[PDB]
Amino acid sequence: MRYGHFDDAAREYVITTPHTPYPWINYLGSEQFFSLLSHQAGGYSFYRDAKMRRLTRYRYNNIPADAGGRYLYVNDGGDVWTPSWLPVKADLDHFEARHGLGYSRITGERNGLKVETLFFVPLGENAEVQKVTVTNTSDAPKTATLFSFVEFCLWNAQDDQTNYQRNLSIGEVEVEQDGPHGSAIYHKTEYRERRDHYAVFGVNTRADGFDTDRDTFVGAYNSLGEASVPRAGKSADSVASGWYPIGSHSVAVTLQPGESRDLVYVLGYLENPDEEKWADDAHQVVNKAPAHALLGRFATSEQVDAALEALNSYWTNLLSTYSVSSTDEKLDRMVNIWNQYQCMVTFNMSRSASFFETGIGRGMGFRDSNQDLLGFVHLIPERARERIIDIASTQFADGSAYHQYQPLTKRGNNDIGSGFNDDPLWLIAGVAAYIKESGDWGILDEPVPFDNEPGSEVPLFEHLTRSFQFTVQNRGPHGLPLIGRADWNDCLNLNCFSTTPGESFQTIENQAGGVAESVFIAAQFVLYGAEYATLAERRGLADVATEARKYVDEVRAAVLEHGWDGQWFLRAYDYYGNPVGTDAKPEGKIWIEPQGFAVMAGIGVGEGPDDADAPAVKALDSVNEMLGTPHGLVLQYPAYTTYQIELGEVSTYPPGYKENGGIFCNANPWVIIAETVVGRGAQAFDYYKRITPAYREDISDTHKLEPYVYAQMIAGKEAVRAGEAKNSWLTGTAAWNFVAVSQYLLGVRPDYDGLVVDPQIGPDVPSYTVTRVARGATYEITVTNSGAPGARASLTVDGAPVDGRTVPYAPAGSTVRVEVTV
Amino acid sequence: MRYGHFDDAAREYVITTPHTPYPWINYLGSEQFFSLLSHQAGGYSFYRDAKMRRLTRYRYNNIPADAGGRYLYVNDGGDVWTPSWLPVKADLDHFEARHGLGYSRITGERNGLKVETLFFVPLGENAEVQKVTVTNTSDAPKTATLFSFVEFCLWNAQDDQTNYQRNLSIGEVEVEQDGPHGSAIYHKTEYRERRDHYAVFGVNTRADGFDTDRDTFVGAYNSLGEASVPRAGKSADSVASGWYPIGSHSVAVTLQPGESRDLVYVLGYLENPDEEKWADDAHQVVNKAPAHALLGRFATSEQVDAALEALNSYWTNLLSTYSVSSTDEKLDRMVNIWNQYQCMVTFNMSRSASFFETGIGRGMGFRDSNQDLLGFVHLIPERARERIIDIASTQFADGSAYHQYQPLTKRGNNDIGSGFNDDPLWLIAGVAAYIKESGDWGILDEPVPFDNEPGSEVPLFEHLTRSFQFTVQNRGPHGLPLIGRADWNDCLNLNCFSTTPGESFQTIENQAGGVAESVFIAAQFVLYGAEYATLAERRGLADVATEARKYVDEVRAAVLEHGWDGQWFLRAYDYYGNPVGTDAKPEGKIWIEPQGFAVMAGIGVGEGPDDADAPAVKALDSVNEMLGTPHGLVLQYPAYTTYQIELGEVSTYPPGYKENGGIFCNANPWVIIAETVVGRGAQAFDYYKRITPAYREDISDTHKLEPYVYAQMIAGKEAVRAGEAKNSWLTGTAAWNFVAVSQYLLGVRPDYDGLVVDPQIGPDVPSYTVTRVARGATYEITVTNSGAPGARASLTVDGAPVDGRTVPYAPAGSTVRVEVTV
Numbered sequence A, B: 001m002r003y004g005h006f007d008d009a010a011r012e013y014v015i016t017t018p019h020t021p022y023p024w025i026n027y028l029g030s031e032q033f034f035s036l037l038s039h040q041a042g043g044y045s046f047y048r049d050a051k052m053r054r055l056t057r058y059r060y061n062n063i064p065a066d067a068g069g070r071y072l073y074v075n076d077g078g079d080v081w082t083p084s085w086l087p088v089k090a091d092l093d094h095f096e097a098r099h100g101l102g103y104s105r106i107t108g109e110r111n112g113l114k115v116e117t118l119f120f121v122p123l124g125e126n127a128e129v130q131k132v133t134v135t136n137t138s139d140a141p142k143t144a145t146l147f148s149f150v151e152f153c154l155w156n157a158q159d160d161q162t163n164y165q166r167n168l169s170i171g172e173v174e175v176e177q178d179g180p181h182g183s184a185i186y187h188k189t190e191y192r193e194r195r196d197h198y199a200v201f202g203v204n205t206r207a208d209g210f211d212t213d214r215d216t217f218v219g220a221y222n223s224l225g226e227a228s229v230p231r232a233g234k235s236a237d238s239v240a241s242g243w244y245p246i247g248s249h250s251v252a253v254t255l256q257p258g259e260s261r262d263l264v265y266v267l268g269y270l271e272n273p274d275e276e277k278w279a280d281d282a283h284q285v286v287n288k289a290p291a292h293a294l295l296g297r298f299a300t301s302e303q304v305d306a307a308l309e310a311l312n313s314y315w316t317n318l319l320s321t322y323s324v325s326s327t328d329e330k331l332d333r334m335v336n337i338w339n340q341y342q343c344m345v346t347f348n349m350s351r352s353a354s355f356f357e358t359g360i361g362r363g364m365g366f367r368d369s370n371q372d373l374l375g376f377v378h379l380i381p382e383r384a385r386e387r388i389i390d391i392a393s394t395q396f397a398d399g400s401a402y403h404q405y406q407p408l409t410k411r412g413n414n415d416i417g418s419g420f421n422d423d424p425l426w427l428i429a430g431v432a433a434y435i436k437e438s439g440d441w442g443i444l445d446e447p448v449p450f451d452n453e454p455g456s457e458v459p460l461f462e463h464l465t466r467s468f469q470f471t472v473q474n475r476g477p478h479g480l481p482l483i484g485r486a487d488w489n490d491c492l493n494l495n496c497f498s499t500t501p502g503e504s505f506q507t508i509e510n511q512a513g514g515v516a517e518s519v520f521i522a523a524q525f526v527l528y529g530a531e532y533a534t535l536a537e538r539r540g541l542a543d544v545a546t547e548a549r550k551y552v553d554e555v556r557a558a559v560l561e562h563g564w565d566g567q568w569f570l571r572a573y574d575y576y577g578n579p580v581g582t583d584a585k586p587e588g589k590i591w592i593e594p595q596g597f598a599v600m601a602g603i604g605v606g607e608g609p610d611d612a613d614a615p616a617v618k619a620l621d622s623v624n625e626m627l628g629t630p631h632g633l634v635l636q637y638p639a640y641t642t643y644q645i646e647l648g649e650v651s652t653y654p655p656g657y658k659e660n661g662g663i664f665c666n667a668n669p670w671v672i673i674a675e676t677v678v679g680r681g682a683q684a685f686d687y688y689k690r691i692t693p694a695y696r697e698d699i700s701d702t703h704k705l706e707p708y709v710y711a712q713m714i715a716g717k718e719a720v721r722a723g724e725a726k727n728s729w730l731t732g733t734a735a736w737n738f739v740a741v742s743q744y745l746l747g748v749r750p751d752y753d754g755l756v757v758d759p760q761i762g763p764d765v766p767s768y769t770v771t772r773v774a775r776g777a778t779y780e781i782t783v784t785n786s787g788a789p790g791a792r793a794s795l796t797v798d799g800a801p802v803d804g805r806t807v808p809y810a811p812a813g814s815t816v817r818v819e820v821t822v
């Protein structure tokens, strides 16, 4: 059961019906201006920050879902329809939506008129451009009137949705029917006061009519599907004063048989300097100069086409760093196109704004943006470098950090909680990934403030020291790191004990004292603490490095001595020192996070995959047996069936959802990587397939959400909805699966001084070639892979055998030809 | 131009079409459980607190407005319609909605089936009850299936609308088709964890089927008007897991011509003790005991009719304290029914939850609840006493207060700002009003904490001292009170200077220093500081009262020496010491608030209304000429046409709306009362009529909002929407207009030791009788009123002349007969 198909050649997912299981969206824009666009044109646009500068209005939990967005009502003979199907839902002769890289096309045809709209955000522009092609597909001349529609948001999305007592009186527009390139509407709410920015909605023709008042265009008592103006066949030329500003133009079109016409529409974000805000001395008329400029940049079809081609070439360049050619077209399209595109989206969006995240409370996460860098550093390392400096600037002098920052201002806030004790080490992970990818050791000398405070700058390396020493100096009675509010699992809140509803577990005040410790953070510390030691060694700091490796040794030993339950790693100790994630308890016996992470860190790894005695093997067998399902690995088993006061939010989910028995996808890749470490390629690859979009496309009707991107959660076996996803697009799962597949399964992974080539994928991919650009050289990596259990590669480079699996980095302009035998 | 009419005998407003200019609501409930109910059954319900315990979901800014509520879909041979008209919008043969005191009835008829629903919140119950009567009005048998529908909210409304990434997995329900009185659905989201409460939706018959999943009931791609289940003609028996829980039952009914059937539905809020939360040892099944009991209390039509009659008698009793019989039926319906009913609603809701206030950021206001007490103390003095203690408990030791408190917890917060310097004086105003009404001097001895701190309790009188002294100790260079963040006008922010958007002026950090002073607070202190001085003397604190009288006299002199512009009172001095509200500036020349309040306080009052040299008369004449429009008096003139950085939020509204040139109705009765003080009854009554619902009913298409309640703002003459109101129901306009008409125009006003009888209403009301119950005796006050300017009453009581206009309070069970000659 499928609603579409992948088009690899066009780098598109083609949706062949309006009637998907749920709205399926694309993101347009990769720089500072973003649009969410569903396959029914639903969604919204924002500049830098979805909460603070949201241009256009979108209703979450609408009835029906996704009724609202960028509509073009066609009136042909009194019949009104939209090519996006919603909101009018007229029967279409033909419908198709293609979601591509930074653009989508939606096409609807009815009664001899085909209307195709290309939507995209052009490079270097803070604007969503639409090119509409209307074609007369009948054998007689046709006429119709097209009515564009977008509903503006009053910038601050939180105020827009809750502060009507003020905001129904502040909506302001200007209307310019006869501008330099066509007609434009300006949405300028609050430009009278503190905003130096306004929006424009314009078209490259002189429109017959316009409307700026929603209530007049739609009509009293009517939904969008029943809009009065398009049914009457004539705009009302409404000029809004408060209430609900919109942008709408009417355009009369006439077409000979087989003839088409292109219209270009632009939604743009403009700023003026304070000294030039106004066209008039009375300060009532906005200075339209930047809007006129933008509209002249997209005044013709040739301009749109040229910008769409520049975007296509930009994607080709971005995707040229890592690619694979294998026997498996599903694996290839993920590695080559979709997983990398999704890593761009998560880099830009963090967990802020999707069709599930509402673009209000959540900004750029400290943990989330570090995990995202893992899968992003090969794509645009300069932008990764800058994101590291932004993130690190929100860290405090003691090594702890704001959990997230406001994207518009880059200042940290406590809006979704504070004191998550895994956050500091994630900074080490992101910088080490960055340095291995780029060889830019100089980033460690970059001056970086604490909490953006002028004069507080220290080199970025010293921030890593603060992160490292935060964990060293905050260990509990077993020598494991204190958990604080929660670790990577936000719902494991051991210092909470809340019995009173009203406040989120993520923000509620926690109690001081206790001895709550995390095995997860212990594993994270052994893994990334070893990276910090290497960075210190490279900087000549022999005493810092030696001491660092000693602490890493103590914590590893603490995990084996006090974090081991017998057949799997313990999860935590609670506030009173009682173990969590032990077979001694009836529920929450085994939790996935320490099994994946401890083994990734090398803890408990013995002689080989068939060392029965090794703790890593026992842990992974337990995972397989107790957490394994056909849709992936659940977070813990059994789920909790009653509220456990001492554990916080985790048991408040019904069993099989989110952190209580859900398949929490971000943790799956840790087990996939763990299995490659022990030498079980076939098992690692099997788990990759269970959660990976291209492999789940055939069950589109079960997964429900986009078949082309990872989601945060799939409902687990304990859920009546087992198999169904929530929270698509915005998840650490995108970066960490990209890591897993590109670096551990396919095995091509940068290290500080060379490229490790260490395939561990099992027999289902018996040969493949990776082309990898690293440190200015191209490595063509040809793999013959028996998939024999535990077998690891030997290499020949440019015809000479080499020792080991690391190819020392070659000087730039090389093609290095690596032949791999597994 | 009208959409209904008043029915005085039934104490109802009758809306005779679905097609009003805006949804027109009623409030059900007077105690702890409340429903907002539109004339199309739209709205929602909550227990105590609209933010934290919202039982049912409502979308503000829905398209169309108010699509969502308590619906009853009728399927009659495949034809589907709702008697509320929305959401199906099928053509109705007859439609009527009647909004009454605590209940509403909505009736719709189509093709021989009439469906009438009575909605109400019964006394002493946390439930909304609907009694539905279906009548076959045709000449042949009918069969129809009735589908009830309500959509649940996940309690925390803020979370409900923003936190889908969590809350789409937590919705949980139980279904009980075979309960003790009929069928019921339980909505129990988070009852698993910290919540001790759940909602029930039940009907008093064994239903044919049920639905609890919205998406199954409504159908993919469908709006509520197109819901699949009612169109199919049978329930889907859906059991929700996450997503959107609803309550729906189906009942097939068969009726002979003329036959009717009653069905009783209940939406109830239930709590269990922690120890009795669960029916079963495993804690998986909710204890239904309180829901079964509730459903048993409304299992019959007779039980509903009894509760409805008890609610009618409760309102007859509440309205027996003050009533008027005159020759003006518009005046009498406002005084006897609608204004008192509104004051009950504002007492209960403050500014929290309406069709404009979103029941999220706003709780119970310190200023707001004190102003509302002014019009409520005579209705239920025992509840007003309790509210005073609740408010005063959120005051700090230095006399300043939290600006509002959370209704569920009664604890103050800064969610809409802090340091509004008019706040502390309002407490004195509320307590003086209460003691005058009740003679309950012992309230001053009640122990009241500061900021709810156990152990911090001082007598309530000492809180008034802290109020009084905060003003004394915070006056500026001219002897006028420092303004702080704002005074009563929340948009006058003289300490703000914000040039960067992103944060509300109400919450944004303010600048220390400057000399900004408020003439409004000066007046407020003269008026209420004088009451404090009286209270101090009555408490035996002679020297404290002598000191208080002296400070009142200082501030009074300062208003005339430094707060007088020439022809009207100044508004403020800004942060720099420059006057605000002076004829020296081009915009904002004259502000309404100090003209009304300074003259209420007696400042500038001369020999009589024809003393053209008295500053009060000059000021009121400038008000009439500069601020007076046919819709009421605007806040200031001219409105600001550009942003004035030193004045904060005010100039951010486009001219003619809200605080920038809007008719801000709460300030009008200050001018009405001021005009009675100077002896111009005719002009006072004129201003009362310009804004009063019964007088504006004849321009319902202009006003747009409910024609039976005051609104916060009517757009002013500078707006294109001149005459159109926003923010109905929840405004201090209701209490202050009640004070103006009952106590100053009709002239019947409690004082500490007697009842003042001082009519000042002009010639349009030449005879009337007030019946007033005060301090346990009833006063029958018969007024013969020439309305000649400046003529004041003389009284005879029980046949004997009295001196002056104060009738000393008679002992209980008197009928005191007062004859009044003006």
Ligand SMILES: OC[C@H]1O[C@@H](O)[C@H](O)[C@@H](O)[C@@H]1O
Residues within 6 Å of the ligand: A165, A166, B416, B490, B491, B506, B649, B658, B659
């Ligand atoms: O916070 C509440 C306040 O918000 C301001 O924007 C409005 O202008 C005021 O009228 C309102 O009282």
Ligand SMILES: OC[C@H]1O[C@@H](O)[C@H](O)[C@@H](O)[C@@H]1O
Residues within 6 Å of the ligand: A416, A490, A491, A506, A649, A658, A659, B165, B166
């Ligand atoms: O604040 C964000 C956190 O909210 C919690 O309610 C969810 O369970 C987490 O998955 C999420 O990461």
Ligand SMILES: [K+]
Residues within 6 Å of the ligand: A488, A489, A490
């Ligand atoms: K997480």
Ligand SMILES: [K+]
Residues within 6 Å of the ligand: B488, B489, B490
């Ligand atoms: K106010």
